[PDB]
Amino acid sequence: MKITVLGCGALGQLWLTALCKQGHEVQGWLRVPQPYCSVNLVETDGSIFNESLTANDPDFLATSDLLLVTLKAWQVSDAVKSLASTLPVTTPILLIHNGMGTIEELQNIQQPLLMGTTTHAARRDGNVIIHVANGITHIGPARQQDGDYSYLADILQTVLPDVAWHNNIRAELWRKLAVNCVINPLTAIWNCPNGELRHHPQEIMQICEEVAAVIEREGHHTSAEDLRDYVMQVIDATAENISSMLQDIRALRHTEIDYINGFLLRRARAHGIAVPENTRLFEMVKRKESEY
Ligand SMILES: Nc1ncnc2c1ncn2[C@@H]1O[C@H](COP(=O)(O)OP(=O)(O)OC[C@H]2O[C@@H](O)[C@H](O)[C@@H]2O)[C@@H](O)[C@H]1OP(=O)(O)O
């Protein structure tokens, strides 16, 4: 299959590598055009894939069977809209990122729009990407109009196992969002590893009470206790890690906060829910951001 991968960062190079290894015809797409896309990825078995791949070829884009989008949330919707007039109107667009609210920005996309999440881990070390952990990728329809593109899960399962189609991808994304609304801003504000959050059960539960209220009203049934329990399992699993948001703060990069607690705020507003703690996290990270 012919794929354009938008984003040639860690996740993009993971997908580009896996795709090349199965003989799919690929290119990269870079927001800041460069003559080619550098892929330099060390697999779980220590093998190296180091390859310069085509980038930003509009004819390749125009005949691609899939646009696979691996940008950070705040980069996604502008980049996708800028390509959508070139991409054939039947060609699916699959977004994989953390955070939510890009779909709300892509309502007028005429292409099938899909969203995805994965538990693969790919970490940048220098100019090298390391495939740290294998995992599971779930994809499904982004909006109610988007139909059955499960064939894409069947193809991608042979590229980067495991992949499954989930019509209720949106419920899964909300549950991930709930965890992200806790771990990311608290770690970024407190400049601590994820496991330190254990010591703030009151603040966690309060964030979870707020998120559960919003999720409930969005039509997905959940509990503050269920979200808290999932937050603690994720914290337990990543106790020593430095969060992506804290890494962003430490490196003086723009964060994903507008698509994490920011998105929660926009959805809370729309349902008349008061979210005082999420608001504080959001404003605090925004303050930290505009010191650099
Ligand atoms: N397992 C996953 N499941 C669903 N989404 C994932 C997963 N892993 C990452 N992503 C997301 O894809 C988007 C792109 O992530 P990367 O490929 O890591 O971005 P990029 O490579 O541009 O940035 C990575 C290097 O350059 C810095 O921007 C960053 O801190 C890192 O050292 C973000 O929303 C990234 O999420 P986040 O910003 O790392 O929380």
DSSP assignment of 39-94, as one string? EEEE-TTS-EEEEEEEB--HHHHHT-SEEEE---HHHHHHHHHHHHTTS-TTS-EE
Atom of ligand 1 nearest to the CA of 120: 1
For the domain spanning 168-290, the CATH number is: 1.10.1040.10
Give the whole-angstrom CA distance, residue 2 versus residue 104. Answer: 27
Q: Compute the residue count for the chain.
A: 292
End-to-end CA distance of the chain: 42
Q: Is 72 a pocket residue for ligand 1 (Cβ < 6 Å)?
A: yes
Helix (H, G, I), strand (E, B) or coil at 193: coil
CB 30 within 8 A of CB 50: no
Resolution in Å, one decimal place: 2.0
The 3 state secondary structure assigned to 112-159 is: CEEEEEECCEEEEECCEEEEEECCCEEEEECCCCCCCCHHHHHHHHCC
Which atom, in ligand 1's list, is nearest to the CA of 247?
30
Nearest CA to ligand 1 atom 36: 98
Which residues belong to CATH 3.40.50.720 in the chain? 1-167
Provide the β-strand partners of residue 53: 37
Technique used: X-ray
Architecture in CATH for domain 1-167: 3-Layer(aba) Sandwich (3.40)
> Could you give the 3-state DSSP secondary structure of residue 32?
coil
* 288: annotated active-site residue: no
Nearest-angstrom CA–CA distance, 245 and 256: 7
Does residue 173's CB lie within 6 angstroms of at least one atom of ligand 1? no
SS3 label, residue 3: strand
Alpha carbons 178 and 123: distance in angstroms, whole number: 23
Q: Is the CB of 146 under 6 A from ligand 1?
A: no
Q: Are 153 and 163 spatial neighbours (Cβ–Cβ below 8 Å)?
A: yes
Query: Could you tell me where in the chain the CATH 1.10.1040.10 domains are found?
Result: 168-290
Tell me the three state secondary structure of residue 160: coil
Cβ-Cβ contacts under 8 Å for 200 (sequence gap 6 or more): 186
